[PDB]
């Protein structure tokens, strides 16, 4: 049915942590203002991604029960979700309503950022698939939390411990889906289906970055840890 006092408490807590992220407007304003070379964009991307991972560790640490997890499992969850979380966030930013013509220019600018064509079409397919769901800020925050607390992640020693942490969050998202879109009973299923399409970007991220039309692919030491790059 409708959220319990405990669920409402958990939702507002997840929301506050989620909003500690760099504002969508701060990112789209920079892209839309002027066109940049592939070298300038690759640099914008690495700084964007470094800030994202830093803010992600802080959001993750605040997830109920995360700090009670085995420390090696804590790293495995972060390493396993960081790329997925960035693309989900990029999809969110992409689908924010902007003035007439703005989202067409944003799309065109990203399309010519330096990344190869073969990664452009799968990436915009996902962004636009996410857009059709017409997700709320609360749905994005919970889906990110659910992505991080994935028990079926590689190197996870205690899967049941992660299951126990993800289950209450899945219950809240399911309820929000019945509240926000009661005319679409498939909404919760669509969102979870979208998480499988997120997993595909996780396999091609290293290639996606190294295929960028730049002479040198320089990354920060933190990005070399979460991403499989040198």
């Amino acid at each position: 049915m409708e959220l319990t006092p405990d669920q409402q408490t958990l939702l507002h807590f997840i929301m506050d942590s989620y909003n500690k992220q760099r504002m969508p407007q701060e990112i789209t304003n920079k892209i839309l203002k002027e066109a940049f070379s592939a070298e300038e964009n690759f640099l914008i991307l690495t700084e964007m991604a470094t800030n994202h991972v830093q803010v992600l560790v802080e959001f993750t640490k605040k997830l109920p029960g995360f700090q009670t997890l085995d420390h090696e499992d804590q790293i495995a969850l972060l390493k396993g979700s960081a790329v997925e979380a960035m693309f989900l966030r990029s999809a969110e930013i992409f689908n924010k309503k902007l003035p007439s013509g703005h989202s067409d220019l944003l799309e065109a600018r990203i399309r010519n950022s330096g990344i190869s064509d073969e990664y452009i079409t799968p990436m915009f397919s996902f962004y636009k698939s996410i857009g059709e769901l017409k997700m709320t800020q609360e749905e994005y925050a919970l889906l990110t939390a659910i992505v991080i607390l994935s028990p079926d992640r590689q190197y996870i020693k205690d899967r049941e411990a992660v299951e126990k942490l993800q289950e209450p969050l899945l219950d809240v998202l399911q309820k929000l889906c019945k509240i926000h879109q009661p005319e679409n009973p498939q909404h919760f299923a669509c969102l979870l289906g979208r998480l499988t399409e997120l997993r595909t970007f996780n396999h091609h991220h290293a290639e996606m970055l190294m295929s960028w039309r730049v002479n040198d692919h320089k990354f920060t030491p933190l990005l070399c840890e979460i991403w499989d790059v040198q």
């Binding site: 560790v57 790293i75 972060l78 390493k79 840890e225």
Partner: peptide, 11 residues
């Protein structure tokens, strides 16, 4: 080895 992730996780 992920000592930056480990550092960020434990303060």
């Amino acid at each position: 080895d992920h000592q930056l992730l480990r550092y960020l996780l434990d303060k």
